[PDB]
Structure formats: C-alpha cells, structure tokens
Amino acid sequence: YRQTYWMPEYTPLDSDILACFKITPQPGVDREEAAAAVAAESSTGTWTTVWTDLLTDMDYYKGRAYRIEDVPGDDAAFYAFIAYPIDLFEEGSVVNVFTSLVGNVFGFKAVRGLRLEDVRFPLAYVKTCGGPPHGIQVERDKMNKYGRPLLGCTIKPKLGLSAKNYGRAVYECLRGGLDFTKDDENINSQPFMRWRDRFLFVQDATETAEAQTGERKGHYLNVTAPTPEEMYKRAEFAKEIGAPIIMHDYITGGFTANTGLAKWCQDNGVLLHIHRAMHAVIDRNPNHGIHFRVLTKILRLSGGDHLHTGASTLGWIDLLRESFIPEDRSRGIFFDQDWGSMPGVFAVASGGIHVWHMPALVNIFGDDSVLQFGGGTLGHPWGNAAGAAANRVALEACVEARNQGRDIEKEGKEILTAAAQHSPELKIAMETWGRDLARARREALSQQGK
Amino acid sequence: EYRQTYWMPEYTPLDSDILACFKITPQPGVDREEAAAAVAAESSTGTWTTVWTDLLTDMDYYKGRAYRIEDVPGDDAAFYAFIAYPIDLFEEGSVVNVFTSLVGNVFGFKAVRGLRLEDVRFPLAYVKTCGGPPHGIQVERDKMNKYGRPLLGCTIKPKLGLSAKNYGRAVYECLRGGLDFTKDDENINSQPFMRWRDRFLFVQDATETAEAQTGERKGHYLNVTAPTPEEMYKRAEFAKEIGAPIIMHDYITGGFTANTGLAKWCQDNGVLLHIHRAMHAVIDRNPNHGIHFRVLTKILRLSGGDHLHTGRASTLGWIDLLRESFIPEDRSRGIFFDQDWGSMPGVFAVASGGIHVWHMPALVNIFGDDSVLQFGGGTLGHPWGNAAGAAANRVALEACVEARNQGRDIEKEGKEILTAAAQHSPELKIAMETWGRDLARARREALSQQGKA
Amino acid sequence: YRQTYWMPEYTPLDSDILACFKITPQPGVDREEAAAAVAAESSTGTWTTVWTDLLTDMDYYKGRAYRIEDVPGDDAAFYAFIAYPIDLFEEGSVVNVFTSLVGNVFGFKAVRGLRLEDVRFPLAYVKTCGGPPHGIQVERDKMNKYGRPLLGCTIKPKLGLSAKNYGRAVYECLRGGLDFTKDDENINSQPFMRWRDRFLFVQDATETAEAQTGERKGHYLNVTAPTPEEMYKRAEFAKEIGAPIIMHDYITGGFTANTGLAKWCQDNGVLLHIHRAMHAVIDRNPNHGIHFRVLTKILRLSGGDHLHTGRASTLGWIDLLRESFIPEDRSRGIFFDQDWGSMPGVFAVASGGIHVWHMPALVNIFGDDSVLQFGGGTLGHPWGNAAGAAANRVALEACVEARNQGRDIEKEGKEILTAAAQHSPELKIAMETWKESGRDLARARREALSQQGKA
Amino acid sequence: PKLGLSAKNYGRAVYECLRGGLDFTKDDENINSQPFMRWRDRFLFVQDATETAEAQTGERKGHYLNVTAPTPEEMYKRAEFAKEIGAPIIMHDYITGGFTANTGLAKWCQDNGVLLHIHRAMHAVIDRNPNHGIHFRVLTKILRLSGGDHLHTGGDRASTLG
Amino acid sequence: MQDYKQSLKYETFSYLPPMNAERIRAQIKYAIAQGWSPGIEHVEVKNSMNQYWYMWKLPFFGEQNVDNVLAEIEACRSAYPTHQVKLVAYDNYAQSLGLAFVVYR
C-alpha cells in the first residue's frame, strides 16, 4: 500500500475533496501503511495491479494519504489526511461522495477502529449541489420572523392519537405563541392516524391558530415514506392544502430520497425541516463511525432548511450556518470549509429542555435557531397554550436582556423572575420544572482578493 | 422513571408483534430492568413523562414493552432485552418506518454505554405488507435459464478512470469467458470519466456480443444509484429500454426509501435487482454499538432485492435468513427469534472479496447452489486475459459441483478435484499456479398434515 | 374425494382462510365424503389426478375439510368447516378470495343445497386489504358529528325527476335536520336526469341547506356506472364540486370496481356509502347461496364507510361490520372468531319502511354508530320534507336524551315521543300520521391482550 | 442595485416605486436567478409588492419579471409561474436569450394573456460601428415579427424617430 | 388552573409588556452596535401581516444617534396615530433584518 498511496509531499489542490480519518491500528502496523491503506480502500479498493489498470492514468485516479498527525491522547490513534481529485465523484451527489468515502474502508481488517472526522468539500463541488431549498435568510423573510430564535413543540404521544386529537394539540400550542409544531420522526402514516387525515387537521389547526395570533404559523408535516412516490405525494398534498413547511428523516429515509425532496421543496416554495433520526447509530462511538459534523455537511449540500444539532457542538453549528468556517482543531474542525453563497441552515435544539434552559439556549445558539420543547410545552399544568406562552415569554425576555447587554446565562434566574411578574404562565412554569469570522473574511477578500 | 410502565416480564408477545433483541451494556449505576425499559420506551413512546395528551390515548396498547431479560454468554457487562411492539405502531409496507422507529432515537441514550440491535422478529402479518424481492431465486433462475450450480460474477477494476467503451471491453472479455455476470462497483455511478448513459450502451453491447458467442444468458449489474429518485429511475428505465436483464443499487447509501421504490419498479418491469451493502461496516462491525448485519439482511429482503452480498456461525445464520422460507431460533448462530417469511421468496447470497480458484471448494460447500460467487482480481488477474480467468473459474466451479454431486467431500478433497480438472483446462491449470433448507421443508410438511398442532 | 381432502386431525393455522359451508347432501352420500368434495371443488377441483399435479406440493396447495358439525334442528343438513392456506389467494383481492371460494362448488350436482355461512379472514390477510376509506371515527371527525346516530333520506320517486326538482327535495330535507340525503341504487345517469346535472343541483342544495343550518350536510351521489372510466369520472366530479360523500352499488357494479373506488375515496378524502342491491338474490334462500354476513366482511375488506345492514344474525353482522374483534357465537350465526385489528369499522345503515314510531327500537338496536335512513317516512309528512325531517330529527334526539338518562327507551317508547311532541308541532303531527356489548367485548379483549399478551 | 438585493428587499423597492405613481418596475437585463435572489423568491415578493401598491393606488401595476434563462425549459417554467401568481407582464432579453427562445416566448405569451417587455441587451456589440454590423432598425423589425409588447429604442434623432 | 387569554400578537417582544422610551432605546443601541441600519415602518392595524408596510422616510444609514431615531419614531406615530409602528434594523451582510418589533400597537 505505502508505495503507491502514501504521498507525503503532495499538497492538496483547491478542487480536491479531503478526508480526515482517525485510524486506530493493530499494534504492529506502521502509521503510513495504515494511512495509505485507507486512502486506497476508499478510492481504488485494492493494493495490487491488474492489466485493466494500465489502460488508465493510475497517477490521477486515486486517493492520496498526504499527512499524518498525532491525536492528543489515544497514542494508539493517529489522524490520516487524504486527498481525492474532484473527478472521482459524480457532481451533485452527496450519495456518491458518501458511498465513495465510507462504502468500503470501514470494514478494513487492519485497523482496530476507523472514524471519519471531517471532509473538505471544495467550493467547485459545493457549487454542483442544490443546497438548502431556502436557507435561514429566505425562510425568515417568508415567515416574517426576525430578531429571535424560533420556537417549536414536538407533539406527543408519538402514538395512538387520531388526526383530529392530534390537530387539537397542534392548535393549542400554536395559538399559545410557538412558531412551529412538529410531527415526530416515527409519525408517517400509521393505522391510528393516516397521513392524509393528519395533514388536513394539522393544517386546520395551523390556520385557526394563525388567524387568532396574527403571526405566521407552521407545522413540520413528516413525509418520510416507504417509496419516493409516496414521499412526493405527501409533499404535494401539503402544498395543495397550503402548509408552509414539511419534514423528512434524511438518514433513515435516505440521501437519494432527501436530495430529491430538497429540490422539490425549492421548486415549490415549501420549507424543509430535517430530522437526524439514527445519527447516533453512526456518530456516537468515538473510535468507529462517522462524526456528526460530516453528517452535517452532507445535509447542507443535500438540502435542508432546519437541522437538529443536538465545543464540537458549536463547531458543527458554524459549519451548518456560516459562509466560511476556518479550521479550528479545538472544535474538531480539521479543514477550512468554504460554502460560498450556499445558504445556511437553521440549527434546531431539542431533547428535554424547558424554561430554565432558555437563557443558556439563547446564549449558545443565537438568534438563527429553532428551540423545540417537547414536554417543556405540553407538560405545563395549565395546558398547551399556557406552556407555549410561558416558553415564548421566557425566550423573548432572555433576548431583550442579551440585547440590553446583560450576561443572560449568569443573570438567568433574575431575567426570568422579573418577566414572570408580568406573565402568570411563565411564573407557574418556573415552579413546575462564527459569524464575525466569516464576514471578516468576506470584507478582507473584497478589498484585496488573495 | 421507565421501569413501571415499560418493564412487563408477564407479557407474552402476540404473534402479530414486532420483536427486537438489544444487547444493552448499561452504565455502572443502572440495573437491567430499568435499562431494558428505557430502551423500550425510547424506541416507541419516547418518554417516561405523562402529559395530559397521553391520557387522550390508550397508553397501555400504544407502547413498546420489554418482556424478558437474559445474560450474554461470557459478558457480564452486557445483557439482552427482548422488546415487543404492537403491529399498529408502524406504517404498513414501510421498512423505513419500522427502521426509524426501532433505531432512530434510542442509540443516543446516555444511561447506556453500548446498544446493539441483534435481531428483529417480523410477524407474518407484517411481512405480507411488504413487496419483497422483485423476483427471488427460483424466478430469476427461470428467467435466466440457470440451474444446478452457483452463479458466477466479476467486478470490473479499476473502479476509476475507465471510459465507457474501455469498460465494456473488460466486460465483454469476462462474459465470453463463461462468467454469468459482471458488476459495476458500488462507487460507479455517473462520474466525469464514464457518464452513466455511455456506460449502459457499451456494457449492453458487450453483454449481447458475449451472449451471442456463448449461447448462455449474460448480464451486468448496472448501477442506478443516483443523487435523486428521478435520476435513479431514469437510469433504471434506460437499462430496460436497451434490454439489460439486471440492475444494481446501493441500498444503504442510496437509502431505504429509494430502494423500496426501485424494487417495486423492478418487479413491475421484469428487471432483476442486485443489491450492494456499501456502508454496512459503519453500522454492523462494532459488536457493542450498532445494528447487526442480520437485521440489515432482513430489511433488504422486505424492501426488495434479488441478490444481496452476505460476506462463521452467524454468517450462515443470516444466509438462511436471506434465502429460506422459515428459520427457527438458534443462539449458536445469533438467531434470537423464529423468522417466518411465508411465500415471500428468498434472495441470492453473494460472496465477494479477495477470492480466487482455491476458495471454490469451500465456497460451493458453504453457500450451496443458490448463491453468486463474485471474483475481483480472481478473474481480472489471470495471466492470459479476462476470458481465460473467467474460464478458469467457471471450470473450477463446475468441477466442484460435479464432484459435490458425486458424493465427494469437496473441502477435504479440494486440491485433488481442482488438479484432476486442471488436466482438461490450460486456463484453470495456470490459474492454479498464480494463486437449513431441510428444516424449512420439514416444517412445511408437518404443518401441511397437522396444521397448528 | 375423501382420502386426500378430509383431514379431521388438521388444526387450522392462524394464517389460514376458513370457510363454513352448510351442506344438504343428496340421499346416498356420507358426510365425510361430501365435506371433502366441497373442499376439493372449492380449491383444486380435480376430477382426475394427472402428471402436472406431481410437479407441485399437493399436500400444501389444497383446501381441506377438518371438522363437521350437525345443524341444530336439521338432521338433513350439516356444517363443513374448511381451511385454505393463505398462499392460495392473491393478496388484497376479495375478488380472488370470493371467486376461489364460491366460483365453482355451488354447481356440485352431488349436493342438494350449498350455503356459505361464514368466512374467517385471518389478520395476516386483513392487513393486505385497503379497508374502509375512512371508517366510523374518521368520518365523525370529518363531519363533526358526535353522540347520536346519523339521519338520512332517500329521494323518491326514483324515476321521472329532473335534476333541479330532485335537488329541491334534497334541499327541503337537509334544511329540516337530516345529515344525509341519498340517490336511489337505480339512479345512475338516465335520460330524465343526467348525472352531471344531478351532481350540480344536489351540491347546490347541499350547500344551501348547510348554510341555513350550520351543520355539515351530505348527499350520497351514486357513481355506479357502466364502466370503470365512467365510475371514476363521476367520483372526480363530486370531488371537484366539493361533495363530501358518494355512493356505490358494490354487488351489481362489482367488487373489482368497488375495491378501486374505495382506494380512490381514501386517496381523495371522499366518504363512501355502499348500497347492497342484489344481495337478496344471493342470501335469502337459507339452503342455497351466500349468507349476508360473508357479504358484510367482503365489503369491509373491499372498502366502504357506510353499509346497508337492513334478528340474532342481524346483530351479529353489525358487530362484524363495526367492531375490532368479534368472538365466535353460534347463537348469532358467527362461526369463527374474526379479528379486524386496526382496520376501521363501517357505519351500519338502517332503511326500509321506517318512520318515527320505529325510532326507540332503532336507537336501541343499532346504537350511535349507525345511520337511520327514512324513505317515505320523511317525504310523506303532511307538511313537507323539512317538517318531516325535523320530526324524525326531534324523535331521534329525544330517544338519545332518554337513553343517556337511563330510561328503557324501547319500553317507554310512546312516552318519550309524547313528551317530545309537546315542543315540536312537527313531531306531533307526524305521530298521528303513522300508526303504532359487541363494543365492550372488543375492548375487554384488547385490554386483556395489552397487559398479558398471549392470554 | 442590480446585484446583491434579496428577494424581499428587492420587492420593497418595487412596492415603494409602484405606490409612488409609476406604472411598472423592471428587473435588470442581468437579473435572472442569481444566488442572492433566486427567481421564484423574487417573483413572489415582487407580485406581493405589485398587488399591495395596486390596492393602495387603485391603478393597475406591473413589474417586468425577467424570464431570461439558461434553457427553454427554465424560461417557460419561470413564465408559467408568473402567470400562476398573477403577474401581468414579464420580460426577455431577446438577443442574448436568442430569437428561437424569444419567438417561442412571444407565442406562449399570446396564448396566455401575459405582456412581454423586450430588452435589447447586447445590441451595441452589433449595431454601433457604422461600417460593420447590423443597424438597429433591422433588429427593430426582427423583434416586432418575433414578438414583443415593449422594446427599448433609445442617437442622431432622425434614425431614432425612424 | 388559569385560563389562557387569547389576543393578537406582533412577533418579537410582543409577549412582553409594551416599551416606554428607555427600553426602545436599548434596542436601537443594540442595533447600531451590531452595524445594522435602523428603519421605521407603519401600517393600518388590519394590515400588519402584510410583508410590505408603509416606509417612514428611508433607513437611517450610518446613523449613530439613538435620540435621532427615537424622535423619528415619535414623528411617525404623530403622522399616523392609528397605525401600528415598527422598528427594523437592516443587516447588509446577511440581507436580513437583525431585529424588528412593533413599538406602537
């Protein structure tokens, strides 16, 4: 392997895809044979040479291991940096780039563990992908929502609710002050709630709550389906009935399906909320799998307008949202990632948060985020509308504080208690439970280029 | 806390229930009943909380519930939770929804160190809702006119850099040599150096030319894996438009939605569907955290394919899962539930990956007739060309099958059989120098005379 | 026939389709051999075993008689119980199941009479069929109607009425208090009232009465048609114009058409009212033909949202139509457990010469999840269709308010109706005009299986 | 600016213009579907601007939405969406888009009641040198036959009036 | 339990008590400090869901005097006392509004 595939003097081209693999080799392997093996197994599949290879330019069509680094800690693991000429891949196909990097090497017997940490998508390849159907800024304009994170509520129980009872919980949430409610990942078209009936009553709920609040309202109607035809049919019905946003399970429904849904959403002006169902099967083992920041770049190319994003955390949020993200090893960002004009994707926070988390969530995620309260909304003692108002008051007072200059996370309890003197719903609720870097680069480049 | 609602050791599963077996490695503080219960809740009704909306529903029917706990032989850190799910929790005919429901949330549960889905029991009433293989083994054999032996394939290398016409030339040489199939690699889609439509024209040209010169049906797994469903289907239609018998898909990297749709399209159009399991090792290698390949095997059979790559004990476990009509429980092979497929057809097991003439006796002895044997370098690497390597492998496969049919022990007698055939075959001789169903049939007989008894 | 098709030790598998045939044998044939013949004639129909049979697995691919019982109070007839493996049939095709069971054997000369009494559709086969497009609970939610049986009128005369006059009767009925009016089963598209004109004026009537009452109205527009293309064209026009409900004659139009129409109704959100015209040709003779409870099951699988249900047997097939699980009960002609699972249930429809004086017995026999369709009992009111509709609607509610209060509404019938007329002049005039647990079992079993599973 | 305005900020300028008293606003000949303002977003917010200014003035309003596009599929897709949302007039660069696209677009526009504003982008590459090229009055006749409801026409006065 | 009281809303800060002159001021100070250009808009109450409000004057580009904005807000509220009045802060890098909110409902 090392003869052909370890190329330490190779400086990558701006058009190459680059991959950073954290290799954990067996005790008797030299780091360069392992790095050259991973370059070869993720590009040409072999070490040998048969007569058909000599019909081709073997020097151009191969991945190159071009640098090896230590891992702070695990002295039994090293980072292997690999370059792939842009021509190994079909344009506009996260499916083909993804297949090529991870479709084969991860069974390699010669390593104890393989972990794909990051992938440098060159700007020449980004420009071939459809990207977000709309992206953060177009979505704020469509929904007419500026100055705060958006608020959402995943409806529960995921199971056993009729369409109409389901619509009831949606209506009571949206009228309370939440921007969005959300179908669960597992809600597709089950016997207790067929999709067509759910879509109708949810849309009823959405228009009734919108007319009673004068704020635009959304609900992520989940179109994840058994086949592309069913997926598209469901997306078409949401458009026919006026629904402004739909949802897809991009990993379990799949990249081919999702890339297609994203492009249909842009063709049809339908916002697209993305769920990362099953990411943890893949991204949780720090020694074997694919890191969620790779999964995050895949989705932005493929297409999403929202994405659930759970140090590392704030790295992949930048990757999801900003125009340029500089290399930052302290955040596991191993390469500069340039996105150009490809719009960024709303970062979605979820999982067991309530009013007490509000000051931190506004602090950490910033304005261009969606904050999704499951039980934090429904579990309010006075019902869904009261808990939506509580969450909306808390969010808005944490934002007014931040704007006023205060350390919202330290003055958290104080900010909240003061605004609860104007909102019973909030007070009872308390009792129950990157950009500047990207723009600095644009200005600098506008003045003198390189 | 989950234990009270989701731990039901008194529950006996209905025959219509989906069952799962998780290998749970709990954190040091958590005891087994509570881990099993959390897993069951986080993969069905994803909470311990009772909010008012739950009281609108029958919380007792609409939940997964853990019903049995077991030790893991030789691992005290881990244990098995067996969990039952009412058939009503899932969209019918949608492995996308059963997959999402089972594995789309629970794997991030912080109170567990490692979670691994070992097996899933699909009830007959849910199997009958899924399309299954577009043809399956026996129908494909009829269409292709091949009986009494494993099928033979070769994957074209290099995977990168070949023009459409150069590629078809390696295909032609292989096929005319006696191989039944050739194969696009998983990464072969539509890259700048070989656009997909050009590849399809020249491969099909090679397929027709080799079929004319041999008198045996030929095919080449044309890869329709694509960025979008629209591109996938367009590529599939063109392969039918030109007369190709078989196409190919990367069901995991393209996705379960696209693949179910492709299988449906294939069955509606008479095109065989060869399935590649790319990415699977990301998921099924680590024995403490992920999804075992035998689960990935069952989802493919239900989603639809006519061939699946299958790669000791577990390996032939999931082969039986892939091909046979009924597979009884067997923990010696990692089969944790009886799996009844009914009349849903079996899928060819495909063996590939660094194999040559010398592996033939073991391959025939292990996979049997209803398998495809894929040779990478083992055909391209022959020193007289592709045609001769194809012939060498074809002769060595046939000699093993004739030897097996005759009562010989083809593994114990591997060298002798191949040598005795080497004498009538210069291609094989120099190539030698360079390098279960009984059970399902028994149960069907018994259930025919006695029924339920 | 006997040695291969009589299997008294076979126990049916849960995947099996089961049939119960009442056989009246010819004088000189034994019961064993006649059961085995009915099983063979309704599955393999072999009169001579030939070489192609030996190419197949003959033990699997055959119906089999597995039990025989006496017919209580009839020594000349007996019950033959037959199992068919699920593989004998095309999935999701009542057409294929029907044809297989009843397409050949009723002409068996060696029997004096043959009557198919019941069919056990196993869950694993139920899951392959589309079922009702909506079902009782979805429909109630779509129409925003709860706590009382629904009320309909069938427009008469069936013949001679222009599209506009026909809409006039519809308008007068709907505005007085009925939820539904109905096309007769013969009303398709005849010269005196072309269907497109009928649909337009009925929809106009529907909308006008709906605006004047504030309750959702509907009218079962009959799309029974010469051809599937005409059937689907008529259904599409009802959706185009806003109509919530359509009607099909599923027997006379036929199962292939009906199954496709139910699929289309679910895909388009149109409710589907099913008329059982022709059934008495098939199901009236107790010795020869197909019992209506089979035809009930076929319709639930094929698809419908209402079904006309027209004593002990009657209450039995209503359960089969509406409930999620129905236990065996020979006293109500139910010969096998029938599990429907999550497949929704269907509104039962009562029609045929009923007026206000039947209302207590109707609310009491049928309960809430039913439609009470008044033919002449609404139109015949000496004050018109609106007053007749209001009278029926007052009588319906007062019987519901009585029953919710605990009263024996059927015994105290003439009293509840009389206290009601003291506020509705329309109900009073109508009273001088004309003279004179299935749910709980299903719930008990779902809860039982929910806590214990197999027990 | 022809560059860098989002769809919504673009619509704001259109709205403020239209309500002022102008009958039409206009995409620039270079405005097609650039990354800072995708065409669908632009059409929606322009049409919103158009209707809002029309309702506030009681005078019919238009905005030449520019359907110039890389292929005739894209051109026709964008034209239909303009009719679909109610826009009364669109716009095409007949010379740089080309006479085949334009004659086809003119025919579509007559079949669909949509007015067609024509931009003579690039004419001066062709019609400026008085000793080599094609005089603009030729391009003027071509456009009329090809089809347009408006054409940009301005020189030495005599020829211009001509 | 207390019963939630439904009423119309107007997006950011409208679930908070109205703003005097001091709390408005801190919002204009935030915006100017973020590099955003403040602007003022107004529209009849029944049209507040319109995407395009009437613009008061032009955006205050490069403007760094909070009191200059505050006064123009007052000046707009005087010109249209029945109209709603909104404060927006144009962000030129993102082509978005860094902030918007109604000051008089």
PDB file of N, CA, C and O in Angstrom, chain B residues 268-286:
ATOM      1  N   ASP B 268     -42.374  -4.523 -11.319  1.00  0.00           N
ATOM      2  CA  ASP B 268     -43.320  -4.078 -12.336  1.00  0.00           C
ATOM      3  C   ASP B 268     -42.735  -4.097 -13.746  1.00  0.00           C
ATOM      4  O   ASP B 268     -43.496  -3.939 -14.700  1.00  0.00           O
ATOM      5  N   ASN B 269     -41.416  -4.265 -13.903  1.00  0.00           N
ATOM      6  CA  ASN B 269     -40.784  -4.152 -15.206  1.00  0.00           C
ATOM      7  C   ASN B 269     -39.936  -5.360 -15.606  1.00  0.00           C
ATOM      8  O   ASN B 269     -39.383  -5.357 -16.701  1.00  0.00           O
ATOM      9  N   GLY B 270     -39.806  -6.372 -14.754  1.00  0.00           N
ATOM     10  CA  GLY B 270     -39.098  -7.589 -15.102  1.00  0.00           C
ATOM     11  C   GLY B 270     -37.590  -7.495 -15.085  1.00  0.00           C
ATOM     12  O   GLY B 270     -36.913  -8.277 -15.778  1.00  0.00           O
ATOM     13  N   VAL B 271     -37.037  -6.556 -14.319  1.00  0.00           N
ATOM     14  CA  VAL B 271     -35.593  -6.347 -14.229  1.00  0.00           C
ATOM     15  C   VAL B 271     -35.108  -6.876 -12.889  1.00  0.00           C
ATOM     16  O   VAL B 271     -35.619  -6.479 -11.832  1.00  0.00           O
ATOM     17  N   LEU B 272     -34.123  -7.765 -12.929  1.00  0.00           N
ATOM     18  CA  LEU B 272     -33.527  -8.256 -11.698  1.00  0.00           C
ATOM     19  C   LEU B 272     -32.793  -7.121 -10.994  1.00  0.00           C
ATOM     20  O   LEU B 272     -32.344  -6.155 -11.621  1.00  0.00           O
ATOM     21  N   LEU B 273     -32.650  -7.254  -9.676  1.00  0.00           N
ATOM     22  CA  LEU B 273     -32.094  -6.189  -8.834  1.00  0.00           C
ATOM     23  C   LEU B 273     -30.998  -6.732  -7.910  1.00  0.00           C
ATOM     24  O   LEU B 273     -31.292  -7.359  -6.884  1.00  0.00           O
ATOM     25  N   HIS B 274     -29.742  -6.452  -8.263  1.00  0.00           N
ATOM     26  CA  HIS B 274     -28.582  -6.824  -7.460  1.00  0.00           C
ATOM     27  C   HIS B 274     -28.271  -5.739  -6.429  1.00  0.00           C
ATOM     28  O   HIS B 274     -28.081  -4.573  -6.786  1.00  0.00           O
ATOM     29  N   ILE B 275     -28.176  -6.129  -5.158  1.00  0.00           N
ATOM     30  CA  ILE B 275     -28.113  -5.192  -4.034  1.00  0.00           C
ATOM     31  C   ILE B 275     -26.705  -5.189  -3.450  1.00  0.00           C
ATOM     32  O   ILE B 275     -26.157  -6.242  -3.116  1.00  0.00           O
ATOM     33  N   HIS B 276     -26.123  -4.006  -3.315  1.00  0.00           N
ATOM     34  CA  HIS B 276     -24.823  -3.855  -2.679  1.00  0.00           C
ATOM     35  C   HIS B 276     -25.014  -3.284  -1.282  1.00  0.00           C
ATOM     36  O   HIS B 276     -25.838  -2.385  -1.080  1.00  0.00           O
ATOM     37  N   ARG B 277     -24.252  -3.810  -0.320  1.00  0.00           N
ATOM     38  CA  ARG B 277     -24.390  -3.417   1.078  1.00  0.00           C
ATOM     39  C   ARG B 277     -23.346  -2.390   1.510  1.00  0.00           C
ATOM     40  O   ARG B 277     -22.902  -2.417   2.666  1.00  0.00           O
ATOM     41  N   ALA B 278     -22.947  -1.488   0.605  1.00  0.00           N
ATOM     42  CA  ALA B 278     -21.972  -0.457   0.942  1.00  0.00           C
ATOM     43  C   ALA B 278     -22.404   0.299   2.199  1.00  0.00           C
ATOM     44  O   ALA B 278     -23.596   0.498   2.446  1.00  0.00           O
ATOM     45  N   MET B 279     -21.419   0.711   2.997  1.00  0.00           N
ATOM     46  CA  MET B 279     -21.533   1.433   4.265  1.00  0.00           C
ATOM     47  C   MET B 279     -21.849   0.507   5.437  1.00  0.00           C
ATOM     48  O   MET B 279     -21.701   0.927   6.579  1.00  0.00           O
ATOM     49  N   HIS B 280     -22.270  -0.738   5.198  1.00  0.00           N
ATOM     50  CA  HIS B 280     -22.785  -1.574   6.275  1.00  0.00           C
ATOM     51  C   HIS B 280     -21.787  -1.717   7.425  1.00  0.00           C
ATOM     52  O   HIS B 280     -22.185  -1.791   8.598  1.00  0.00           O
ATOM     53  N   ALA B 281     -20.487  -1.773   7.112  1.00  0.00           N
ATOM     54  CA  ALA B 281     -19.495  -1.948   8.173  1.00  0.00           C
ATOM     55  C   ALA B 281     -19.420  -0.743   9.107  1.00  0.00           C
ATOM     56  O   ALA B 281     -18.956  -0.887  10.244  1.00  0.00           O
ATOM     57  N   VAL B 282     -19.868   0.433   8.658  1.00  0.00           N
ATOM     58  CA  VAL B 282     -20.030   1.574   9.564  1.00  0.00           C
ATOM     59  C   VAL B 282     -20.987   1.232  10.706  1.00  0.00           C
ATOM     60  O   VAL B 282     -20.888   1.790  11.808  1.00  0.00           O
ATOM     61  N   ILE B 283     -21.913   0.305  10.464  1.00  0.00           N
ATOM     62  CA  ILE B 283     -23.062   0.080  11.325  1.00  0.00           C
ATOM     63  C   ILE B 283     -22.944  -1.227  12.096  1.00  0.00           C
ATOM     64  O   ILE B 283     -23.395  -1.322  13.241  1.00  0.00           O
ATOM     65  N   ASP B 284     -22.392  -2.262  11.470  1.00  0.00           N
ATOM     66  CA  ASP B 284     -22.501  -3.616  11.988  1.00  0.00           C
ATOM     67  C   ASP B 284     -21.175  -4.222  12.404  1.00  0.00           C
ATOM     68  O   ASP B 284     -21.139  -5.411  12.736  1.00  0.00           O
ATOM     69  N   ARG B 285     -20.082  -3.464  12.361  1.00  0.00           N
ATOM     70  CA  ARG B 285     -18.807  -4.055  12.740  1.00  0.00           C
ATOM     71  C   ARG B 285     -18.664  -4.114  14.256  1.00  0.00           C
ATOM     72  O   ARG B 285     -18.448  -5.191  14.820  1.00  0.00           O
ATOM     73  N   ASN B 286     -18.808  -2.975  14.928  1.00  0.00           N
ATOM     74  CA  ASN B 286     -18.584  -2.897  16.373  1.00  0.00           C
ATOM     75  C   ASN B 286     -19.604  -3.742  17.129  1.00  0.00           C
ATOM     76  O   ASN B 286     -20.802  -3.424  17.095  1.00  0.00           O
TER      77      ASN B 286
END
